[PDB]
Amino acid sequence: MRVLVTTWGNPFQWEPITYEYRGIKVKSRNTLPILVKTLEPERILILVADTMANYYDSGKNKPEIEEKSFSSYSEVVEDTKERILWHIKEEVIEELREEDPELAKKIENMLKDERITIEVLPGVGVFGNITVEGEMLDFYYYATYKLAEWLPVQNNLEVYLDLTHGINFMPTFTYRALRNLLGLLAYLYNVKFEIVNSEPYPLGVSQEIREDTILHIREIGEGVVRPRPQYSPVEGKLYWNAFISSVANGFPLVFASFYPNIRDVEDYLNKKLEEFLVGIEVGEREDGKPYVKREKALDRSFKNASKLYYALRVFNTKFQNYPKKEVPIEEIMEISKIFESLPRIGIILERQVEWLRNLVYGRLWYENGEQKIKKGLLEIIKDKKDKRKEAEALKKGKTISLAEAAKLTRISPNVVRNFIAHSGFEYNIVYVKYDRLSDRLYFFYKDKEKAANLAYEALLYRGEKE
Amino acid sequence: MRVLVTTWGNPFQWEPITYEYRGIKVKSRNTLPILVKTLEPERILILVADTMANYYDSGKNKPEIEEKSFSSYSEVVEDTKERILWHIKEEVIEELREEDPELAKKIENMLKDERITIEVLPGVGVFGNITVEGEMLDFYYYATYKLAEWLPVQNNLEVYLDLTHGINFMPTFTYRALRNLLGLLAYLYNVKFEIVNSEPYPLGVSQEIREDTILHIREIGEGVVRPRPQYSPVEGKLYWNAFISSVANGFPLVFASFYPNIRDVEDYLNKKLEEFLVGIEVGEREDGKPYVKREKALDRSFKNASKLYYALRVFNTKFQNYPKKEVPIEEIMEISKIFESLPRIGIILERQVEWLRNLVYGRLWYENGEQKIKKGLLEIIKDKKDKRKEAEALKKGKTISLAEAAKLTRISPNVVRNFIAHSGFEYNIVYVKYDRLSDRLYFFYKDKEKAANLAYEALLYRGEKE
Ligand SMILES: [Zn+2]
Ligand SMILES: [Zn+2]
Ligand SMILES: [Zn+2]
Ligand SMILES: [Zn+2]
Numbered sequence: 001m002r003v004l005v006t007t008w009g010n011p012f013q014w015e016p017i018t019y020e021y022r023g024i025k026v027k028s029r030n031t032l033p034i035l036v037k038t039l040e041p042e043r044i045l046i047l048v049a050d051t052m053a054n055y056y057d058s059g060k061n062k063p064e065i066e067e068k069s070f071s072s073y074s075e076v077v078e079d080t081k082e083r084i085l086w087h088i089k090e091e092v093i094e095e096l097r098e099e100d101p102e103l104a105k106k107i108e109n110m111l112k113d114e115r116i117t118i119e120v121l122p123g124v125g126v127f128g129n130i131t132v133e134g135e136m137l138d139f140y141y142y143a144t145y146k147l148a149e150w151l152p153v154q155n156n157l158e159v160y161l162d163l164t165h166g167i168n169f170m171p172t173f174t175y176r177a178l179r180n181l182l183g184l185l186a187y188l189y190n191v192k193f194e195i196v197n198s199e200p201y202p203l204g205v206s207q208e209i210r211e212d213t214i215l216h217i218r219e220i221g222e223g224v225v226r227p228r229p230q231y232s233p234v235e236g237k238l239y240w241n242a243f244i245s246s247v248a249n250g251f252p253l254v255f256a257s258f259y260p261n262i263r264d265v266e267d268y269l270n271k272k273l274e275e276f277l278v279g280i281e282v283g284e285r286e287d288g289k290p291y292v293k294r295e296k297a298l299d300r301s302f303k304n305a306s307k308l309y310y311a312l313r314v315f316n317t318k319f320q321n322y323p324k325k326e327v328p329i330e331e332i333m334e335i336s337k338i339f340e341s342l343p344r345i346g347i348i349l350e351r352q353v354e355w356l357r358n359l360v361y362g363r364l365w366y367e368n369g370e371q372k373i374k375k376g377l378l379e380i381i382k383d384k385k386d387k388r389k390e391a392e393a394l395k396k397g398k399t400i401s402l403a404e405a406a407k408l409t410r411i412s413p414n415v416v417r418n419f420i421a422h423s424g425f426e427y428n429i430v431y432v433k434y435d436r437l438s439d440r441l442y443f444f445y446k447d448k449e450k451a452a453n454l455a456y457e458a459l460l461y462r463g464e465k466e
Numbered sequence: 467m468r469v470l471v472t473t474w475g476n477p478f479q480w481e482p483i484t485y486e487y488r489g490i491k492v493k494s495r496n497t498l499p500i501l502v503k504t505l506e507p508e509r510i511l512i513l514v515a516d517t518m519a520n521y522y523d524s525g526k527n528k529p530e531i532e533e534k535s536f537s538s539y540s541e542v543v544e545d546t547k548e549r550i551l552w553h554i555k556e557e558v559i560e561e562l563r564e565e566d567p568e569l570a571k572k573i574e575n576m577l578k579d580e581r582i583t584i585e586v587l588p589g590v591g592v593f594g595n596i597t598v599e600g601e602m603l604d605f606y607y608y609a610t611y612k613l614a615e616w617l618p619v620q621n622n623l624e625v626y627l628d629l630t631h632g633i634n635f636m637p638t639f640t641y642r643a644l645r646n647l648l649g650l651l652a653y654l655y656n657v658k659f660e661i662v663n664s665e666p667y668p669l670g671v672s673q674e675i676r677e678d679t680i681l682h683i684r685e686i687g688e689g690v691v692r693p694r695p696q697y698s699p700v701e702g703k704l705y706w707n708a709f710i711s712s713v714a715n716g717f718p719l720v721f722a723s724f725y726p727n728i729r730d731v732e733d734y735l736n737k738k739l740e741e742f743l744v745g746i747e748v749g750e751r752e753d754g755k756p757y758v759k760r761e762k763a764l765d766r767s768f769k770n771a772s773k774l775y776y777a778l779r780v781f782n783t784k785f786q787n788y789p790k791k792e793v794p795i796e797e798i799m800e801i802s803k804i805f806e807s808l809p810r811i812g813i814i815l816e817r818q819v820e821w822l823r824n825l826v827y828g829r830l831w832y833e834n835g836e837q838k839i840k841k842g843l844l845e846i847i848k849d850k851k852d853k854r855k856e857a858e859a860l861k862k863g864k865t866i867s868l869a870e871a872a873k874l875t876r877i878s879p880n881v882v883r884n885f886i887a888h889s890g891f892e893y894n895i896v897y898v899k900y901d902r903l904s905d906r907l908y909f910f911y912k913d914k915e916k917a918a919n920l921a922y923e924a925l926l927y928r929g930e931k932e
């Protein structure tokens with residue numbers, strides 16, 4: 001699938017110009033036509049700022065919507081959308097009817113379906129049409145949230161990000177939010193991330209020099225996305241962080257054990273978001289214009305939470321039985337196969353995980369043509385002769401330590417390091433239990449709290465240099 | 467140390483406004499004053515684009531420099547600097563004499579020393595003062611080069627990046643180039659990376675509403691920099707890539723063995739750069755204005771090379787005996803201590819490296835109060851009785867394999883994976899040699915070519931998911 005995300009400033013300030021891209025040339029005020037014609041996206045998200053609210057050009061009498069008086073940020077948002085929607089219908093499409101009539105119908109139809117959506121984000125700025133006061137980071141944090149909801153979850157996803165019409169701080173914020181999110185999608189699926197940006201609109205030049213000027217849509221993306229560990233906690237959410245640490249460092253047992261319920265996070269976002277919107281005062285400037293003042297701000301936890309929200313949407317398409325406190329070696333392998341995307345960690349897990357597979361089944365290997373082997377908890381439990389207290393306890397279904405498991409067969413003072421080294425599989429805290437009804441060996445954290453803290457700590461952990 | 471990097475568009479279009487930041491409020495057309503006053507940087511790099519060349523406002527008669535005719539990109543660059551330098555002396559400082567006279571002298575003096583430097587980068591744009599044609603990425607690639615030269619190499623470095631006056635594509639490109647470079651500095655030294663960005667200049671509003679508007683300098687940085695593996699090769703430079711792979715994955719032997727000579731890369735940059743500038747045609751538009759046309763473009767290798775250039779400046783402050791083909795276990799530990807910054811890899815190395823330290827010295831450890839031990843190549847070579855052919859060959863100073871070394875004591879079909887797993891320490895290709903004059907065990911790659919290829923491959927390597 002191919003999707004396009006594009007940041008827009010003030011569309012009513014752009015004049016018609018010809019855009020070139022991959023051999024194709026389409027004239028418009030917006031890049032959208034050339035991008036839709038060249039790329040043929042299946043979806044399009046348009047990001048604008050509430051600083052667009054109430055905009056009106058008296059000399060060009062556009063957009064053809066009256067200036068209003070607002071009382072809630074709710075109206076402010078819907079009004080902004082109305083005007084941007086107008087520029088799209090009454091200008092983008094309209095003016096295409098004389099340049100590429102088929103494209104106009106294509107954009108016209110995409111606008112019918114829910115192919116293209118406009119979203120209004122919190123901005124900053126004192127303009128002739130409105131004044132918006134608040135924290136700048138709000139745009140960024142909310143951006144991460146919006147992308148967290150809209151963004152697809154599929155294999156071979158191609159995300160094109162057009163920063164052409166982005167105006168102040170918008171570009172970098174959106175670029176950062178998007179690469180963070182796509183970086184999480186890359187743990188399971190393949191995805192390309194391209195950034196497009198057209199050359200600058202010719203300024204202060206003769207009408208003759210402006211008509212010979214054709215703007216190139218440039219590709220400046222990073223290409224194939226590689227997953228990247230994001231050490232981004234959510235204040236006051238131990239378990240979540242523990243899970244966040246597992247996706248960052250690769251802790252299979254911690255992954256399954258603290259897998260958060262997407263609705264629990266989804267509702268955290270909802271509450272924090274509601275507390276934000278309500279802090280938004282909607283008044284009136286000296287000159288009668290709208291005055292939006294945010295007295296509450298979003299924090300990085302809201303951003304990290306939003307990130308967690310997208311990760312879970314990516315993972316939930318492959319794991320539904322989690323959280324699970326007692327997981328079998330089979331699922332540990334599944335979970336471990338996720339980090340294959342991050343070679344260094346997946347390779348660390350493959351060995352560590354095979355070892356754990358050997359505990360349960362036994363180890364069959366060769367040394368110089370010779371043929372040596374060892375049995376696992378599985379066999380020991382069957383053999384009626386084994387009277388070793390560990391196998392005794394295990395045979396009854398009693399809980400046995402991972403170290404105790406190392407004894408029935410063959411297998412530092414800085415807990416965090418060792419915990420990182422062992423991928424969360426500490427022989428002190430990881431236990432085993434045999435269930436006869438299901439007929440399987442289960443691994444689990446006996447000490448729920450300390451497993452999470454050790455995990456959490458391994459997210460904030462930083463080696464020593466100086 | 468504290469340094470500031472700030473992107474500028476067209477300074478002659480900005481009007482005076484009051485800037486607030488960390489409780490401090492300074493009025494100017496530029497953010498530089500407020501940033502110098504609040505931060506007190508020891509250095510300042512100002513990034514501008516050649517699209518500033520020949521700029522002149524007829525109504526404000528500024529800058530007070532004539533429009534010229536150019537024949538070489540060399541003049542174009544020096545002229546741009548002249549005008550930006552002018553805005554700084556005749557406006558920034560000048561207008562401060564009536565707002566904060568002490569600050570003016572401070573900026574005046576910093577301009578005397580080489581505290582602040584202006585650099586001209588390749589831009590894109592058709593303007594009333596000049597037309598610049600070329601690839602947009604050139605700004606980005608050259609940016610990475612410029613930062614590679616200017617940027618300091620020290621512990622506790624604080625880089626502030628002001629994107630406030632950045633205009634089109636400049637911000638994101640500079641943000642990306644800077645985080646890549648700082649990310650390499652973080653392998654050895656601590657460094658903070660903050661991004662500052664002022665709120666938007668009030669547009670289309672009454673003179674009364676504009677005077678009540680105070681712009682906030684906002685901090686939107688990432689804070690403490692964490693080193694990040696950069697899989698960025700340089701086409702046609704096997705050895706370099708092998709070294710690049712070692713800094714990315716953590717291959718101590720590969721690090722010391724293919725350590726490139728900084729001058730060899732420095733000269734690669736010089737040649738590629740010269741071939742770029744020479745492709746820059748400097749002509750004249752229909753309207754008499756300057757016409758800069760780049761017929762040659764920089765490629766990502768130039769960027770990656772520039773990155774390699776900065777990494778070497780960071781590493782050269784701690785390693786001068788490299789490249790070294792025969793390195794002792796002592797240096798392997800030094801090299802290994804670098805990745806302590808990236809916990810997951812450093813922890814992988816600590817074990818793998820201690821093992822290699824045990825080969826040379828022997829392993830002294832305890833099992834249940836009991837006291838077992840083994841001897842290393844060191845001791846075996848001393849003991850006159852050992853007649854084992856391996857110790858025999860070794861005692862004569864003959865080359866022995868790492869596997870052969872595993873035998874004299876105690877210690878898949880996908881070569882790349884295993885090579886990654888073993889951190890480049892394959893028992894097949896890593897050899898040992900004892901030198902009696904120096905009295906030390908040396909590890910080395912017998913097959914120079916294949917060690918580099920396997921390394922290189924491990925940079926392009928990607929696990930399997932679907
Ligand atoms: Zn013409
Ligand atoms: Zn209030
Ligand atoms: Zn341990
Ligand atoms: Zn007033």
Ligand SMILES: [Zn+2]
Nearest residue numbers: 745747759761
């Ligand atoms: Zn030519």
Ligand SMILES: [Zn+2]
Nearest residue numbers: 878884887888
């Ligand atoms: Zn192997």
